Amino acid sequence: TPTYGDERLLREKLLTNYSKSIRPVINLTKVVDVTALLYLQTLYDLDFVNNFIMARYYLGLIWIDEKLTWNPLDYNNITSIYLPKDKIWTPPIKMCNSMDKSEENDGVGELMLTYTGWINMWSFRLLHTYCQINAYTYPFDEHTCEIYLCVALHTINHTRIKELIYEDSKFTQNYKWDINVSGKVNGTDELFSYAFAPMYLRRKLTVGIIAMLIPTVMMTILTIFVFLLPPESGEKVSLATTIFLSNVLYLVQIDKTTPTNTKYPSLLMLYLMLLSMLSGIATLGSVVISKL
Amino acid sequence: TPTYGDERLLREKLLTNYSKSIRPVINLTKVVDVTALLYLQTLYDLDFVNNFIMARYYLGLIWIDEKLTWNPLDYNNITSIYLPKDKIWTPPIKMCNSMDKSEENDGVGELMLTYTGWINMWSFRLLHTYCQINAYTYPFDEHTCEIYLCVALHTINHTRIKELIYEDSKFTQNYKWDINVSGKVNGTDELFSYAFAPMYLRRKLTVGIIAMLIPTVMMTILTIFVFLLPPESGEKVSLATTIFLSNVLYLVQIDKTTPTNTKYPSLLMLYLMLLSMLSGIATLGSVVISKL
Amino acid sequence: TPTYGDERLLREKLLTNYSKSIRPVINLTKVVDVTALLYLQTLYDLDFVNNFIMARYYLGLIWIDEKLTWNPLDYNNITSIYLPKDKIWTPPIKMCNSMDKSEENDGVGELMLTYTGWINMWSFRLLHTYCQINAYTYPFDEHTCEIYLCVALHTINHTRIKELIYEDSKFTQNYKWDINVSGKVNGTDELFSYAFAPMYLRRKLTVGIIAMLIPTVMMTILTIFVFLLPPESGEKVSLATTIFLSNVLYLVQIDKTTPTNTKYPSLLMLYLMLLSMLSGIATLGSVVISKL
Amino acid sequence: TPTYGDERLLREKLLTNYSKSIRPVINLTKVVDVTALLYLQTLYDLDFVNNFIMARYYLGLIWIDEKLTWNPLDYNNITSIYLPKDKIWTPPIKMCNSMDKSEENDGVGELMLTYTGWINMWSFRLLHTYCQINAYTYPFDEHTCEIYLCVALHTINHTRIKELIYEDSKFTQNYKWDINVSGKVNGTDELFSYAFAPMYLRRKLTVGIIAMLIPTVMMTILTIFVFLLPPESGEKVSLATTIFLSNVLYLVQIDKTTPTNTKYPSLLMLYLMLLSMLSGIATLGSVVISKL
Amino acid sequence: TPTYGDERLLREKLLTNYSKSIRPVINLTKVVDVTALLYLQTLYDLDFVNNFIMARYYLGLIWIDEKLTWNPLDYNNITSIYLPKDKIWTPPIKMCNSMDKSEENDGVGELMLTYTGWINMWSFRLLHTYCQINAYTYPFDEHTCEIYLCVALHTINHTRIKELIYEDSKFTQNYKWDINVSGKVNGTDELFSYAFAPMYLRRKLTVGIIAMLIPTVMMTILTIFVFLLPPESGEKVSLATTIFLSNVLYLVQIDKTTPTNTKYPSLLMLYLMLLSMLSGIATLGSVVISKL
Ligand SMILES: *[C@@H]1O[C@H](CO)[C@@H](O)[C@H](O)[C@H]1NC(C)=O
Ligand SMILES: *[C@@H]1O[C@H](CO)[C@@H](O)[C@H](O)[C@H]1NC(C)=O
Ligand SMILES: *[C@@H]1O[C@H](CO)[C@@H](O)[C@H](O)[C@H]1NC(C)=O
Ligand SMILES: *[C@@H]1O[C@H](CO)[C@@H](O)[C@H](O)[C@H]1NC(C)=O
Ligand SMILES: *[C@@H]1O[C@H](CO)[C@@H](O)[C@H](O)[C@H]1NC(C)=O
Ligand SMILES: *[C@@H]1O[C@H](CO)[C@@H](O)[C@H](O)[C@H]1NC(C)=O
Ligand SMILES: *[C@@H]1O[C@H](CO)[C@@H](O)[C@H](O)[C@H]1NC(C)=O
Ligand SMILES: *[C@@H]1O[C@H](CO)[C@@H](O)[C@H](O)[C@H]1NC(C)=O
Ligand SMILES: *[C@@H]1O[C@H](CO)[C@@H](O)[C@H](O)[C@H]1NC(C)=O
Ligand SMILES: *[C@@H]1O[C@H](CO)[C@@H](O)[C@H](O)[C@H]1NC(C)=O
Ligand SMILES: *[C@@H]1O[C@H](CO)[C@@H](O)[C@H](O)[C@H]1NC(C)=O
Ligand SMILES: *[C@@H]1O[C@H](CO)[C@@H](O)[C@H](O)[C@H]1NC(C)=O
Ligand SMILES: *[C@@H]1O[C@H](CO)[C@@H](O)[C@H](O)[C@H]1NC(C)=O
Ligand SMILES: *[C@@H]1O[C@H](CO)[C@@H](O)[C@H](O)[C@H]1NC(C)=O
Ligand SMILES: *[C@@H]1O[C@H](CO)[C@@H](O)[C@H](O)[C@H]1NC(C)=O
Ligand SMILES: *[C@@H]1O[C@H](CO)[C@@H](O)[C@H](O)[C@H]1NC(C)=O
Ligand SMILES: *[C@@H]1O[C@H](CO)[C@@H](O)[C@H](O)[C@H]1NC(C)=O
Ligand SMILES: *[C@@H]1O[C@H](CO)[C@@H](O)[C@H](O)[C@H]1NC(C)=O
Ligand SMILES: *[C@@H]1O[C@H](CO)[C@@H](O)[C@H](O)[C@H]1NC(C)=O
Ligand SMILES: *[C@@H]1O[C@H](CO)[C@@H](O)[C@H](O)[C@H]1NC(C)=O
Ligand SMILES: *[C@@H]1O[C@H](CO)[C@@H](O)[C@H](O)[C@H]1NC(C)=O
Ligand SMILES: *[C@@H]1O[C@H](CO)[C@@H](O)[C@H](O)[C@H]1NC(C)=O
Ligand SMILES: *[C@@H]1O[C@H](CO)[C@@H](O)[C@H](O)[C@H]1NC(C)=O
Ligand SMILES: *[C@@H]1O[C@H](CO)[C@@H](O)[C@H](O)[C@H]1NC(C)=O
Ligand SMILES: *[C@@H]1O[C@H](CO)[C@@H](O)[C@H](O)[C@H]1NC(C)=O
Ligand SMILES: *[C@@H]1O[C@H](CO)[C@@H](O)[C@H](O)[C@H]1NC(C)=O
Ligand SMILES: *[C@@H]1O[C@H](CO)[C@@H](O)[C@H](O)[C@H]1NC(C)=O
Ligand SMILES: *[C@@H]1O[C@H](CO)[C@@H](O)[C@H](O)[C@H]1NC(C)=O
Ligand SMILES: *[C@@H]1O[C@H](CO)[C@@H](O)[C@H](O)[C@H]1NC(C)=O
Ligand SMILES: *[C@@H]1O[C@H](CO)[C@@H](O)[C@H](O)[C@H]1NC(C)=O
Ligand SMILES: c1ccc2c(c1)[nH]c1cnccc12
Ligand SMILES: c1ccc2c(c1)[nH]c1cnccc12
Ligand SMILES: c1ccc2c(c1)[nH]c1cnccc12
Ligand SMILES: c1ccc2c(c1)[nH]c1cnccc12
Ligand SMILES: c1ccc2c(c1)[nH]c1cnccc12
């Protein structure tokens, strides 16, 4: 059976002439094909004001090393070892479109290496990644966030992202967003290889949200009613003033929470702007009638 | 008696052929059984809006090293030494479901090693760990937060979490949450070993909270009274308007503080939505009667 | 006179067989007695909502090393040297009850060593330390915050906190809190040595605070006056509504700022809750009289 | 074809007598001309209250090394290698006018070196850079933000910024700001070389913004109307009070969001101050007429 | 002319027997006189609530090394070299009264050394430094902030701060604060040398501020007018209630923004407290007259 001394001998011979900074290819003219595996774990939040999405992923990177190989029968059937991540060449993949707010560094850890040269380098990653969030169809709104991977400095004739396999682990259920992160895409070659996973996010219709909407609907009905009220009823000016006040309160409230960076504005927000304008027109009619 | 030179000799012989990256087993076919001890210290806060719980734990890790052994009679009865945490193999346990906001790194410290090979590696850990917080039964609400431990990259045929012993140290009393973190659970094997401690949190009924509720109750009584008030009393429209205003003020207030990510909405919030709807219906009746 | 070469020779002989990880005692059966000196510098703030106190201290640690000694007459009267903090054994003292938000690491610096073995290791430390803040007697409120020191992993038969000498440096005057941090306490032995300094904090009565109170007092007088107002005066309902509004505005305001984690609620807050209830009862009487 | 052993030999000979701290020039009397390439990627936000702009750039640095050269025919046509960034001399360029909030250190990475000595050192950089933000012509406002580069400590007779080439990558479209970052500028020599890229930012006129203004315009019309209303209409005092309230609500609202550090105040804010003053004058006229 | 090999030889001989931790003096009885140069660059903000001032300085430190000298004619006229900051002894100067929020560590960089032994160690530093901010004379308020330098652990017989030369670089104009940071001061010897630069800050009177004041003045005039209004006018109670509401709105607003830690409270705040008290007295008179 394999022993501690056997693995020690294997590692000692394995790392004899290894340069961490020289790409791991016998012939330097060939590229190293990296296939990345980005399994989402949890979608913590979707910050509308800052245009970010906070999530934790299980970024995986797989490639082939041609210098790190061995006949396992020559080492008592040792088929795999674990190496410190900072002793071996690692492709310079970065979360190109993201602020990596991770708590561990990307050079402290361990990777799994197989006797054929295949390296697995699973790594956890908490990302604050930029998304262009359009709150147009709120609250029945959808969004598309692209999580980018790209090599840092290597050219496509040196290192390439062969493929990007993105899935969802289903660790937790959200109850606020319906996440749809599935599919395979080849890397895009434009001087530096890079790929992106499209994340589709649909807000789930919660009865808390529908209840929060209900006040808006009944205020619209009430505004219509007071606008239809007889000019000589006597309550015109009073209810027009009080409900213009309340309308402006909700307009300020929503406007301070709606994203300011959208391709189009929020339909609901504009519908409440129209409501406030109609309340103002009702007040105008009331004062005009009162003076005349 | 044991001396400084004796411990120096012991350490020098002990670390002679030790590889930090080779698992500590004579035969590599055997697994290293890690038993984790997670004693809670303080529950700083339960952030509802961010769906996190902030606490400080005394994470402990115990396993057995088969290479680090000695006959203590051969070294003047030295029964235990202290080694720097980064010189010895350490299982790659991570707070899988947590943002480790600790201030010290997880590779700077010290561990206690016993002559039989048993290693104790107590470590402090301040965690911002994700919890699905349902504010349904507020303020008589309960919650279940699972604190996850899982090996980072090792397979179950290499490293396993034998057990998880979680308790509460009682360092401090909360006065806001009743914490119930006690029990033992075996590790779960699904390609990577992992376990979780269930933390049950019950909000303690404080008289500050009951006093905060009292205004809501008296506003409900007052709304019922004004709704029952005679249409021809003369105060109908006035009190309906003013109390619809105040109702909406409390509705906005609570809605901006209630969690938006819940399996069900807050019953109290929906009860105040119903109160606001009834106030609106009272205003509708008042205006209808006033015009007719 | 002592020279650079003399100190170089001294250090070279001093560090010859020193192991940073072996406790500094000739006989390992004896404990190392550490006396800690915690001089407060400034009390930046007392955050009520987060239950923390922010301050900057001059944590000092003194112990005796039995391996690091020399006859000063043998080295041209060199009586003390300065060593890098990470080359020498340092007791593993941690701010057990604190989030060390310091900006320098605890392994980068310098310590003063004397020819008798005595080590001084003064270190600055900015702490966010947990305190159970009870806002009961606000604004004439007092608090007790205990700053904890405890060894990280060493047993009481290896390392002990001999004493804790805590004082105040008086660097700055607060004008908001009266600080009383003075006294000496022996360490407490419960498997791991530890001690704590009690910090008493009394809010200083400022005329800004008394002025902030004045509105509350005059609102109480005014509420009493309107409650005593004749039912048939005609201003009853109007002033009851407007002053219930303003009362609720201040009640919401204070409740959003008062700590939610207190042994008892704030007396002033409950007195304003009673004020709001009395305003509601006045409104109830007014509407009842108006209908009848 | 070039091989791993060939590149190993090349690097071994290349780094034989290289001192990272000695400037890379054969004759020390000559300067190293550094040309910097600052390609903007995304303009995350423009924080008005803090006077900062948050963006992510692709800072590039190019210079010539006279010690790191080779005849590529002597090494099987190896024309370029990749070196770790901390093994080679790197010009001490700093984001002089910026808080570098990047997540990777500036001494961990890789650079591209060519057989003629030319070094490319592309590096990602997320910057919180100070800008003097004048909200005068809001919301048709423009701004000029200068991104500064300057050598840290080297004199102009040692290191110089030859040129600064700044462009925009167009990675993402903003929809909130029109960015115009293009042009070439020579470095400025004043004891320490330095250059700056001028960034012009024009707020794009969105229909969400125009809708947000619409309430202000109709309130101005309504204030004019009520000011023109007959003194004896009977609604003067009522609408003057209610609309002074609402005016002050919007004045407080805008004033709490407008930058306090501007060369001139916001015209729109001052126009609404004038609106509030006119409402106050209307109230003055109403009360004066009512008493007389 | 000097060459790369010449500088390599110089550095190799220079660092032969240099100990980074032994003070750089031939005779250890002499002190090292450090003169510090603190040139301010920008005053980002003055945070009133947290009692801090955020600025970026060009902290410089100059002293004399007696071991690092050379005859420049013996090395082809090399008159100065650049050494890595962590290879040479560096005085342990700390921003004693500040939270150093800098992004680079204080042991990564470079210093300029001259053939006579003189070392220049210019370093950038972004500081969050504590200031006792008294908002008494707001908005015509002044402040004095002292930026402290002190040696960390060395005694005055080992290391001293000879002088502190503080100036302003004028990099940017503030438009909000008039900064006056100029002068020279000797170090203060009280067991540990230390000095401080006094920074005087005067708020510049902006027309945005005067316009923001204008509402307060017109509300004072209006309150005087309504208080003078005839008891039997009929608008007394109405305007007293509405303007007590608005007064309390501004009182709450200012009180939540004024610093709570001041030697004396804000005069303007207390003048508005008096305004609110006068409004309350007017309401008291109105209700008393109405009942009687
Ligand atoms: C490693 O390289 C050295 C040259 O530096 C050579 O002598 C040795 O034979 C090589 N060994 C292997 C296993 O490639
Ligand atoms: C490198 O190129 C040569 C050229 O013939 C080829 O024989 C060799 O197989 C290549 N290396 C590998 C690992 O295939
Ligand atoms: C080596 O180990 C593998 C692991 O499954 C096993 O299938 C194989 O039979 C083993 N071979 C020998 C020669 O031990
Ligand atoms: C790879 O591409 C880069 C730029 O695209 C070029 O400079 C380099 O010479 C190329 N290398 C090879 C081996 O083709
Ligand atoms: C996810 O999106 C893709 C592309 O829009 C679609 O084909 C697929 O059906 C979606 N899946 C779910 C579960 O929504
Ligand atoms: C992606 O790459 C594979 C491998 O060369 C190729 O077969 C396939 O056609 C490419 N395109 C897609 C859409 O998979
Ligand atoms: C340690 O390993 C070496 C081989 O590198 C061997 O010569 C030596 O005897 C070993 N010593 C022990 C104590 O195992
Ligand atoms: C390793 O396996 C062999 C196989 O017989 C066994 O004799 C030996 O005891 C095992 N090692 C240990 C430490 O038990
Ligand atoms: C060794 O130390 C242990 C510690 O309790 C003690 O019980 C034992 O008697 C000692 N044995 C010898 C031989 O000193
Ligand atoms: C352990 O499991 C992994 C995957 O489950 C497998 O690749 C590996 O060969 C296994 N090793 C042994 C010794 O069974
Ligand atoms: C804690 O929870 C468990 C399981 O729900 C229960 O058996 C136990 O009684 C609880 N203990 C306390 C103190 O609530
Ligand atoms: C847990 O593991 C132990 C040890 O093998 C076993 O005896 C026990 O049955 C397992 N299950 C539980 C619930 O303890
Ligand atoms: C230090 O220890 C070594 C053994 O490693 C010994 O040969 C030497 O004499 C010791 N020197 C001193 C000064 O203790
Ligand atoms: C250690 O113990 C022995 C036992 O007699 C004693 O003589 C010696 O003095 C002790 N060491 C010290 C430093 O006192
Ligand atoms: C050694 O230095 C101390 C320092 O005060 C002094 O008192 C003493 O006389 C000196 N002794 C000699 C022999 O120099
Ligand atoms: C010290 O105490 C620990 C636990 O309290 C024990 O394991 C250890 O054996 C003790 N050592 C001595 C020398 O008494
Ligand atoms: C500090 O508190 C202690 C204990 O409560 C008391 O004896 C002492 O007089 C206090 N000192 C001051 C200055 O308040
Ligand atoms: C503290 O320790 C000292 C030293 O042994 C002892 O004299 C004293 O009685 C202890 N207790 C107190 C309260 O000081
Ligand atoms: C490098 O410098 C050494 C002197 O330290 C010299 O002997 C050697 O020849 C030099 N080699 C090269 C390639 O410059
Ligand atoms: C350095 O100066 C000498 C002086 O003549 C000159 O010949 C030489 O070419 C210079 N070095 C380089 C790299 O040009
Ligand atoms: C070296 O490589 C370059 C790369 O394009 C090629 O153009 C040139 O012909 C090659 N020369 C030799 C001799 O291989
Ligand atoms: C370069 O300039 C600095 C200051 O401007 C001066 O001290 C130094 O002597 C100059 N060096 C040369 C080689 O001119
Ligand atoms: C950018 O600004 C420059 C200088 O103001 C101007 O010449 C150029 O036309 C501008 N370009 C765009 C696209 O606005
Ligand atoms: C900038 O530097 C270049 C290179 O010396 C020079 O030709 C040019 O005149 C300078 N000025 C401008 C505006 O480009
Ligand atoms: C440096 O110190 C060593 C002793 O460690 C001595 O032999 C050598 O001569 C010294 N060299 C210089 C230049 O001082
Ligand atoms: C050190 O002191 C001696 C005492 O006479 C003196 O001669 C010498 O000059 C001093 N060192 C220096 C660098 O002045
Ligand atoms: C050395 O360089 C300085 C730099 O200005 C110059 O003034 C001096 O003449 C030079 N001397 C020699 C001998 O080269
Ligand atoms: C320097 O002062 C410290 C304390 O002030 C003292 O302990 C030390 O002995 C003094 N050293 C000399 C050389 O005077
Ligand atoms: C700065 O303050 C000092 C001392 O108060 C004063 O002498 C000097 O005139 C002031 N300068 C300015 C520009 O305010
Ligand atoms: C400061 O130190 C210098 C140098 O000794 C001295 O001349 C001066 O009198 C001291 N005081 C002042 C105010 O400069
Ligand atoms: C490194 C990696 C990627 C890039 C780069 C440098 N410069 C760019 C300019 N435009 C687009 C991408 C890049
Ligand atoms: C390492 C450790 C755990 C995991 C991993 C990589 N990839 C996963 C995918 N799904 C679930 C868990 C994991
Ligand atoms: C190290 C240091 C202190 C402790 C520890 C581990 N475990 C504990 C459990 N309960 C209380 C204190 C501790
Ligand atoms: C280093 C680099 C730049 C500077 C410096 C030190 N001191 C300065 C004083 N004023 C302006 C720039 C500088
Ligand atoms: C180091 C540096 C400065 C100080 C110190 C330790 N202890 C103090 C106590 N009081 C004041 C200053 C200090």
Side-chain angles (χ1 to χ4, degrees), chain B residues 78-106:
Chain B
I78 294 169
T79 54
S80 48
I81 58 163
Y82 292 82
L83 299 160
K85 170 184 297 179
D86 60 55
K87 271 200 184 177
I88 310 299
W89 183 91
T90 299
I93 309 303
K94 303 287 186 64
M95 311 316 282
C96 305
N97 192 31
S98 305
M99 305 163 33
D100 192 2
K101 289 221 177 289
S102 174
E103 59 262 54
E104 304 95 1
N105 186 240
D106 291 345

Side-chain angles (χ1 to χ4, degrees), chain D residues 204-249:
Chain D
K204 308 177 74 173
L205 61 88
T206 63
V207 307
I209 289 163
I210 207 61
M212 174 292 307
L213 295 174
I214 289 297
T216 300
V217 184
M218 62 69 60
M219 298 285 285
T220 58
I221 301 305
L222 178 147
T223 51
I224 290 290
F225 214 80
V226 67
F227 167 84
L228 191 72
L229 189 73
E232 308 189 300
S233 62
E235 297 302 320
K236 295 285 271 160
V237 175
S238 64
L239 276 284
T241 301
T242 69
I243 300 299
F244 190 78
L245 268 67
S246 180
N247 270 11
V248 165
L249 170 141

Side-chain angles (χ1 to χ4, degrees), chain A residues 160 162-163 184-187:
Chain A
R160 214 171 77 272
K162 206 201 172 294
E163 323 176 326
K184 191 192 307 204
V185 70
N186 288 354

Side-chain angles (χ1 to χ4, degrees), chain A residues 7-262:
Chain A
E7 180 148 324
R8 213 162 73 92
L9 278 165
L10 180 82
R11 173 175 313 237
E12 184 177 1
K13 195 223 64 169
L14 179 64
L15 294 170
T16 181
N17 280 340
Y18 193 75
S19 304
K20 163 175 165 48
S21 306
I22 304 181
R23 255 188 343 287
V25 191
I26 300 280
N27 291 331
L28 297 174
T29 303
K30 186 184 318 295
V31 311
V32 306
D33 291 297
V34 190
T35 181
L37 293 88
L38 180 83
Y39 292 73
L40 171 66
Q41 189 193 305
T42 79
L43 177 77
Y44 287 144
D45 198 329
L46 197 162
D47 187 1
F48 271 62
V49 55
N50 288 307
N51 295 335
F52 277 99
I53 66 170
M54 284 87 90
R56 162 164 298 236
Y57 309 76
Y58 299 121
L59 167 62
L61 290 176
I62 307 172
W63 71 94
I64 188 166
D65 196 327
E66 308 187 357
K67 308 307 308 298
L68 306 182
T69 51
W70 69 75
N71 197 44
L73 280 72
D74 189 272
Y75 293 95
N76 298 5
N77 206 1
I78 294 168
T79 54
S80 47
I81 58 163
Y82 292 82
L83 299 160
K85 170 184 297 179
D86 60 55
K87 271 200 184 177
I88 310 299
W89 183 91
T90 300
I93 309 303
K94 303 287 186 64
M95 311 316 282
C96 305
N97 188 55
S98 305
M99 324 167 30
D100 192 2
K101 289 221 177 289
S102 174
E103 59 263 54
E104 304 95 1
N105 186 241
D106 291 345
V108 55
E110 265 155 40
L111 59 81
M112 171 151 207
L113 182 150
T114 306
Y115 76 99
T116 42
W118 283 91
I119 290 157
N120 290 336
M121 200 191 83
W122 290 106
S123 157
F124 295 58
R125 290 286 192 77
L126 175 149
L127 308 181
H128 281 54
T129 185
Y130 189 73
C131 199
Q132 214 57 23
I133 294 287
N134 50 355
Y136 173 61
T137 316
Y138 181 98
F140 307 81
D141 50 0
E142 298 172 355
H143 314 275
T144 309
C145 298
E146 303 163 310
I147 306 317
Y148 270 94
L149 287 190
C150 69
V151 293
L153 173 62
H154 297 176
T155 69
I156 299 148
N157 58 33
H158 292 164
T159 306
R160 214 171 77 272
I161 288 188
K162 206 201 172 294
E163 323 176 326
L164 191 69
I165 294 166
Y166 41 99
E167 306 290 358
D168 180 1
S169 278
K170 303 294 195 178
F171 202 66
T172 46
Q173 292 56 359
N174 262 259
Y175 309 117
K176 183 171 169 202
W177 304 99
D178 195 339
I179 309 171
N180 176 11
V181 176
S182 175
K184 191 192 307 204
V185 70
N186 288 354
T188 290
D189 305 351
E190 292 191 54
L191 199 46
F192 308 113
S193 69
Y194 71 97
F196 62 99
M199 176 174 319
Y200 305 103
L201 300 163
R202 183 180 304 89
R203 204 190 286 262
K204 308 177 74 173
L205 61 88
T206 63
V207 308
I209 289 163
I210 207 62
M212 176 287 322
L213 293 173
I214 289 297
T216 300
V217 184
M218 62 69 60
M219 299 280 292
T220 58
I221 301 305
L222 170 150
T223 51
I224 290 290
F225 214 80
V226 67
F227 167 84
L228 191 72
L229 189 73
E232 308 189 301
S233 62
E235 297 302 320
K236 295 284 270 160
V237 175
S238 64
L239 276 284
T241 301
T242 69
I243 300 298
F244 190 93
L245 268 66
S246 180
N247 270 11
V248 165
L249 170 141
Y250 285 85
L251 186 76
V252 167
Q253 172 265 296
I254 64 174
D255 188 297
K256 283 171 167 181
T257 65
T258 189
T260 52
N261 188 215
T262 60

